[model samples]
Target: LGKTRWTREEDEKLKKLVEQNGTDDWKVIANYLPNRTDVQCQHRWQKVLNPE
Candidate 1:
């Protein structure tokens, strides 16, 4: 997997999508983030957005 740094704007967008759609629907969220995949979106949310 290529290491791409996520921009603040992208993060903001992801947050909005997740807020609107919720975590289970990554495929839809990935559509909002062009270069990112559903898996990447899910991983980002789990690893960065809500690390527990």
Candidate 2:
């Protein structure tokens, strides 16, 4: 199994990326942080930040 812990720095980076580019391109996010998968970014943003 893999770990799923998001750090504050990552959150800040994500916030900046989303704010600058908006949430239409997960591939862009993958380009920004190659180690992270696009799905991971999407999950973190939608599940953690913009939860229902």
Candidate 3:
């Protein structure tokens, strides 16, 4: 598996994409975030951005 820390700009982009597309459409979001999979995006949102 590949792993890397996300940059602040990347995080902002991801957050924006999620807001625009919603979490349910990670496949489309993933297209915008290079090197990050849909699962990685989901995990980041869950584990870092909007952790419960």
Candidate 4:
């Protein structure tokens, strides 16, 4: 896997997963994606979802 690009499908799905689990932890949420790393998920939220 290139492991470089985070797909839009994943970005949105990650939101739903987070919605259920909340942002307190990424290690569990990270498994929702076949490729994304746990830390990356938190970083994405820090950069993307925490805003409007």
Name the better of 3 and 4 by lDDT: 3
Superposed Cα deviation of residue 35, candidate 4 (Å)? 1.5
TM-score of each: 0.79, 0.82, 0.78, 0.73
Give Cα distance to truth, residue 52, candidate 2, Å.
8.7
Q: Is 1 or 2 the stronger prediction by lDDT?
A: 1
lDDT of 2 by residue, 1-52 (tens): 5496778888989888887898888889868976778998888897777634
Q: Model 1, residue 31: what's the lDDT?
A: 84
RMSD (CA, angstroms), candidate 2: 2.3
lDDT of 3 by residue, 4-48 (tens): 777788899999998887878777888888788988898889777
Ranking 2 against 4 by lDDT, winner = 2
TM-score, candidate 2, is: 0.82
User: Per-model C-alpha lDDT, please?
Assistant: 0.84, 0.82, 0.84, 0.79
Model 1: how far is 15 from its true place, Å? Answer: 0.3
Positional deviation of residue 27's Cα in model 4 after best superposition, in angstroms: 0.3
Among the numbered candidates, top TM-score falls to: 2
Cα RMSD of predicted structure 1? 2.5
In candidate 2, stretches whose alpha carbon ends up further than 4 angstroms from where it belongs are none
Worst 10 residues of 4 by lDDT: 1-10
- Tell me the number of clashing residue pairs for each predicted model: 0, 0, 0, 0
Looking at model 4, residue 37 earns an lDDT score of 79
